[PDB]
């Protein structure tokens, strides 16, 4: 079977304002993104989205879907399931919350079918317990029989899906097993059936979590089928800034998610007349809510990044900019330089503003 194109939207919600916070969606989304990219998918990966932002992300995803295109949605975060409908809970949901604060997966499926996709895959890595505080009984129109729909639910209806308490960079349960099967050249249904059996051996979740597969796919379609974003993945280029005093500072950028970028700085030339100099970044747009105690770290790990020191150039200062989707205007920030001339006693301070436009998903 052939795909016109293959597009995936991955969302991981962790930093809930009114509900228990999660940890593993970060790792889960990052690793599934890399696997899908190896399968030639265009992938948009986004962390920590509000209701508004999730709906926007879905809208952008739908734009990428056209006749014959394979579309896949993966969601890791809080969720629930009422009267046959699955809901994904955004990080700004109140407590309690109702269907109005959440995105219904069936509504997204309906929109994807309207694009005449060749395959619709939903991988729902979330709990499916009922929301008793949700009294809405919305009736959606019956879906068309397009015989091309596959759901892989991390758990069964009325049950919970898990990640491991206090466990570094571990995957959630579902991804722990999906990751080892995803690259197989097999019908996606068979693939998920294998994953269900693998999970069946996980002692930690026996009796609490089991994969559910639901499929009407009547063709042998696979995530490996040959194909026969764009403005959403633009990264600023490395740049070398020269200060009046002659110091040169290299500023680099790295993409971690579609809405998370790491900036790093290092001194690449210091005039000998200058005994010491330090460069650091400040004054980021308030929308990004950067805390300065968290910026300019000696290691990427300290910024809370998935990237480790081996992933990036060494001996820089690193700053993590998450929530790029919140950026209203250009990403402008200041690079500051402290320095002192040999033989003089005073520290001198200089600074330059840098405008890198709207990077990654901020490009809208």
């Amino acid at each position: 079977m052939l795909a016109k194109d293959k597009v995936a939207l991955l969302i991981g919600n962790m930093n809930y304002r009114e509900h228990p916070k999660l940890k593993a969606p970060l790792v889960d989304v990052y690793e599934l993104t890399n696997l899908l990219r190896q399968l030639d998918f265009k992938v948009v990966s986004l962390l920590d989205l509000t209701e508004y932002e999730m709906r926007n992300a879905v809208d952008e995803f739908l734009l990428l879907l056209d006749k014959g295109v394979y579309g896949l949605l993966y969601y890791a975060g809080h969720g629930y399931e009422n009267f046959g409908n699955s809901f994904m809970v955004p990080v700004d949901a109140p407590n309690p919350y109702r269907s109005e604060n959440c995105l219904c997966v069936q509504n997204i499926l309906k929109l994807m079918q309207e694009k005449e996709t060749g395959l619709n895959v939903f991988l729902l890595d979330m709990c499916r317990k009922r929301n008793d505080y949700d009294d809405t009984i919305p009736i959606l129109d019956a879906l068309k029989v397009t015989a091309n729909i596959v759901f892989g639910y991390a758990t069964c209806q009325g049950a919970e899906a898990f990640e491991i308490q206090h466990s570094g960079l571990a995957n959630g349960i579902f991804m722990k097993f999906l990751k080892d099967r995803l690259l197989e050249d097999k019908k996606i249904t068979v693939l998920l059936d294998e994953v269900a059996e693998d999970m069946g051996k996980c002692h930690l979740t026996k009796g609490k979590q089991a994969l559910e597969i639901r499929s009407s796919l009547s063709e042998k379609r696979a995530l490996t089928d040959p194909i026969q974003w764009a403005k959403a993945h633009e990264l600023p280029e490395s740049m070398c800034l020269k200060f009046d005093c002659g110091v040169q500072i290299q500023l680099g950028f790295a993409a971690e998610f579609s809405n998370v970028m790491i900036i790093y700085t290092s001194i690449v030339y210091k005039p000998p007349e200058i005994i010491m100099c330090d460069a650091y970044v400040t004054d980021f747009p308030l929308d990004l809510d950067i805390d300065p105690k968290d910026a300019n770290k000696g290691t990427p790990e300290e910024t809370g990044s998935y990237l480790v020191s081996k992933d990036l150039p060494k001996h820089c200062l690193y700053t993590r900019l998450s929530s790029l989707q919140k950026l209203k205007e250009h990403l402008v920030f200041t690079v500051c330089l402290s320095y002192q001339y040999s033989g003089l006693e005073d520290t001198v301070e200089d600074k330059q503003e840098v405008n890198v436009g709207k990077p990654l998903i901020a490009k809208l």
Partner: peptide, 4 residues
């Protein structure tokens, strides 16, 4: 474990 931690439920979602």
């Amino acid at each position: 474990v931690r439920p979602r």
